[PDB]
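Retro notes
What went well: the complex prediction finally ran end to end.
Inputs used:
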Amino acid sequence: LVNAGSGSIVDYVKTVLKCIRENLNKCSCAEKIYSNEVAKVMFRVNVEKANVEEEVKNSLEYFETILNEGRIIVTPAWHVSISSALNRGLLVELELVNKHKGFVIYAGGDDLLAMLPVDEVLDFIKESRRAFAGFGTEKLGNMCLENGFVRINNAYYPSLPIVGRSYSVIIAHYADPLFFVINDSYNLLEEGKEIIRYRVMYNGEYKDAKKDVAIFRYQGLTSVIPLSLKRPIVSSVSDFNEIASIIDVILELKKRIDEGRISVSLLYDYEKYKHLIVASDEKYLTEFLVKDWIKRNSLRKHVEFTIDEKLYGVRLTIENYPIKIPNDLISNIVYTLRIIYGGEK
Amino acid sequence: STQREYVFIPITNSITIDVKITIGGSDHITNIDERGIHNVLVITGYAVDEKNGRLVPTLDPCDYVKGILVAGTPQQAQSNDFLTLKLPANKLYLIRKKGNISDDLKIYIPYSSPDARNSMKTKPVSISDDTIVNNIIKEVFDKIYNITQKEKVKIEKVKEDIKELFSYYALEQ
Amino acid sequence: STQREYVFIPITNSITIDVKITIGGSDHITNIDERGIHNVLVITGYAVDEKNGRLVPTLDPCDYVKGILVAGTPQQAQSNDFLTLKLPANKLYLIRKKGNISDDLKIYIPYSSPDARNSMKTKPVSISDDTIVNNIIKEVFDKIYNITQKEKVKIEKVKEDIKELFSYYALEQ
Amino acid sequence: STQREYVFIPITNSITIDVKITIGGSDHITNIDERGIHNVLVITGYAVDEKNGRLVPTLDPCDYVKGILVAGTPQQAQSNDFLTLKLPANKLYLIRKKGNISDDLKIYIPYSSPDARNSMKTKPVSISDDTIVNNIIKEVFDKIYNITQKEKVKIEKVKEDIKELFSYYALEQ
Amino acid sequence: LYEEDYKLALEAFKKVFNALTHYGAKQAFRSRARDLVEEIYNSGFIPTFFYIISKAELNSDSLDSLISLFSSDNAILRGSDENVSYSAYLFIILYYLIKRGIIEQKFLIQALRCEKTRLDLIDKLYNLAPIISAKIRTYLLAIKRLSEALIEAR
C-alpha cells in the first residue's frame, strides 16, 4: 500500500497504516491524519462538502478491511489488468516455444503444454520463467521485456513478476503412450508440486517455500530445481537477474561437458563429495569442495566453473510420497543433467 | 510575532470570554468571512475541565477539543494557568483551513495545572440546547469581531455552524 | 491503585534514572517475558530535544515521543517536573498491550516546562548507531526490569525491537 | 545555441571524461535542486556498444539510450564524432521536464561509427550493484557542482535515479 | 550409520587446519592425510599407529598442546614441519576415539600426561585395533578428501 500511490499522498497513508498495528486508535487517528488532509484541502478553494472527519475514517475503514482480511480487495480493474497481462504473457510465451523449435499443444493464459526437443528444454525453462516475470533479453515479436514490464512500441504494460510458475518436464520415448505421458505430467506436478518444500530465504530468515519448482522426470529419475530461492520472488528491480539462476548453472555445466572441458564422470563422483558439502555449514569451505569436485574429474586444466554460492544448502524435502528427491540442491543439479543426458542416448 | 489567544465552546459556566481587552490592532486568523466559521484550531489529548474549565491534560487520544483562535494576550495579568507556546503556523493542526501564512504563532490557550488527586473521567458532549449558543455566538464573533447582529444573513448558517460541527468531550466531575 | 511512573527513553544523559522507593510489589505494566518489549505507550505532542528534552507537549498529533510505563514514584518524590494526573487506563495509546492492568493507578509522566525563545520545525528521528541501544540496558533496564533477561537465552532482539517500534520527533531547540 | 553535450549513463568504465571544459555558462540541465535528477534525455534508436564508450545507431525505433544533457566541450578536438545539429528544444524524447524552455541548442552527441564489421544486436541492461553506482556518479556527475556530496540532503534520492531512470541497450557483441 | 562422521571430520579438520600456522606444515599435513590413511588399511592400524607416534616426537609442550586442542581453539602445534604434521594426524585419530566413545576421554587425556600410562594407551588400542579400523574409515577417508580440497599451494 505504501509503495503504491506515490507522491504527496504516500506520507498521508504512511500515517494511516501506522495507527493500526496493534489494535490501535479505532477512528482516533484522524488527529494524526486530519492534519495531513485538512492542511492539504486548502491548497485549492473548491472543497464542496468534504467532511474530513469522515473522509479519513472511510480511508481508515478501507485499509482496515484489507489488513483484517489479509488480502487485496478485488475490483474489476484488478481482474482486467491481470487478465490482459495474462494474454500478453501468452504472446511472448508462444515466440519462445517457436524460438526453441518446439510444438505448442495449448498455451491458454497461465497454462502451457508443448513438446520440445530434449536439447532446448533447459534454456526454454530459463527464458520462459524469466519472460513470465517480465524480465528478459532481446525482443521476441514486436514486444520487449523490460524488468517486469512488457513494452510494445513505447507502450509499457505490466506483467506478473511475483507469480510463481512451476514447470514439469517429462523426457519420453517417442513410442511411449501419450495417455500416460500426459497423465504423469498432471500427476507428477499437480500432486507432486503440491508437496515439495525447499529452504527459501525470507527476510533474513530461512523458511520453507513450496511452489515454482520445475520438476524433471526420466522414467524413474526425478529432479527438482527451484526457480526463486527468495520468497517474495521480486521485491526490487535487482531481483530479476537471479530468477531461474540455477538453470544456467546447469546450462553452463552442461555446456562445459559436451566440449570435453569436464568429463561426464562429474555426475558420478558427486556422491562422495556430497556428504561433506551437506555437513559443511561454512561457505568458504564448500566453495572449495565443489571447486575440488569439479577440477578432479575435469578433462582439462583451464576450466574455472563457479557455483553462485547462494546454492549451498537448500534441502528440498517431500512428505511421504512415491517420489524420491535428493535432499540438497547440488545433488538435484546432478540428477537434472543425468535426465537431460539420459534423453540423448 | 503574531501572538494568538484561543477560545473554545464548552457546556459549562466558564465559557464566555475569560479574556479581556482585544487585539489592539486589525488582524486575526480565525476568519468568518465566507460561508460560516473557519480555522477552528483543533487540539487532541486534552479536555474541557467543566469546572473553572480551562484545558486538561488527558493521555486519551480520543479527545477533540477545538475553538476560535484570536490574537492579543489573555488579560496580560494571568501568568499562572496558560501554556505559553509558539509554533510556525504550518506545524499546527487546523480544521476547515483557510489562507496560508508562513509566520510563527504564539498560541495562548487557557490550560490549568490540576495535579489531579482524582482520576480524570471522560464524558461525550455534543451540541445541546440550541438556545444555549445564542449567548456564546454573541461571545465569539460578536464579542471581539462584533460585526454580527446588524445586517448579516448567515445567522441561519451560523446555526448549522454549531448544529453539527462541535462535538467535544467532557469530564462528568 | 499504587505508584506508576512513565519512563521515556531519551538520546541524552540528563534525566537518566532517578528512581527511588519501590511499590511493595513490582507490578510494572511493561512485560518483556519472552522476546519483545510490550505495552510501549506513545502520546501526542510531547517531543524530545535530544538534550535534556523532557517532552514539552506540542499541539500537533504528528509530534510524539514514546516511552515505557512502570510502577514508580515521581523521580525520587519531589514536586518539580511531573503531571501526576490519572485516567482509568481504558482510553490509552498502548501499542503491543499485554495481560492485565490496574484500573485507576497513580501514574507519573515526566514534564518539561514550555521552551520559549525559539522556533522549532521539529523533525522525526529514527535512532541508529547501536552504541546507544545497549547503553539503555546497561543500568537503566537491568535495574528497572530487575527480574528478566538473565534467566532465559534471548537477550539480543530487544535492541532491535526497540528499533522497529521506536521512532519519534526531535525538538532541536 | 547552447553548446550542449550528452554524457550518457551506462555501467561501463568508459564514460570517464569523453568531454572537456564547461558550457560557456551555467544554464545547465542537472536540475537536481528539487528532488534529484531532473530533465532526462533519451535517444531513440541507438546502441551503447558495451565498449568504445560512444553511441551507435540502429534503425529500429525500439531502443533507449539515456543520460543527462550536461554541456561542455567535446574534448576541444572533435567535429565529426558528433551530429553537429541544431535543435529548437521541442523535438526530443525527454523525461521529468520542467517549465518549457523555448530556446534553441547546439548538438554534440558521442557517436561511434556503425562499423558493422560484426553483427549489430541490442542487449537490455540497467544499473544495480552499489559499487556499480559508486563508480560513475563519483567519476563525473558529482563534480557538476561538488556542492552535491558537500551539503546535498538528497543523496539517498539522487543515488536511485541511476537505477530508476537511465536504462540503456547494450551491444551483445 | 556413519552419517555424523562427515560432520566430525569437519570439526576435527578445522582444528588441525588452524593449529598449523606455518604453510609448509599444512602441505606436510596434506601429505599425511593421503598416505597415512592407505597404510592403516594395508599395513594395519597399530603398525601405522606405531609409525605415527614414532614420527610425531611426543613428550613436549606439543603433547600438551594436543590436550588443549581437544577443547580449546587457540592452541598451536610447534615443531618440525614433519613433526607437527604427524602429530596433527595423531590428534585426528585420537579426536575420533574420544568423540565416539571407543576410548574414554578421561583415560586418554590423563594417559597423554602421565608417562607411565602411555604404554597402557598403546596397550588399549591394540585390543581395539579391529574395532577402530572399521569405524575410522569413513572418518579418515573424509579427512583425506578435505585435505586435498582445503589445503592448497599458494
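What we learned: Residues 203 and 231 of chain A are 8 Å apart (CA to CA).
What to try next: split runs per interface for comparison.
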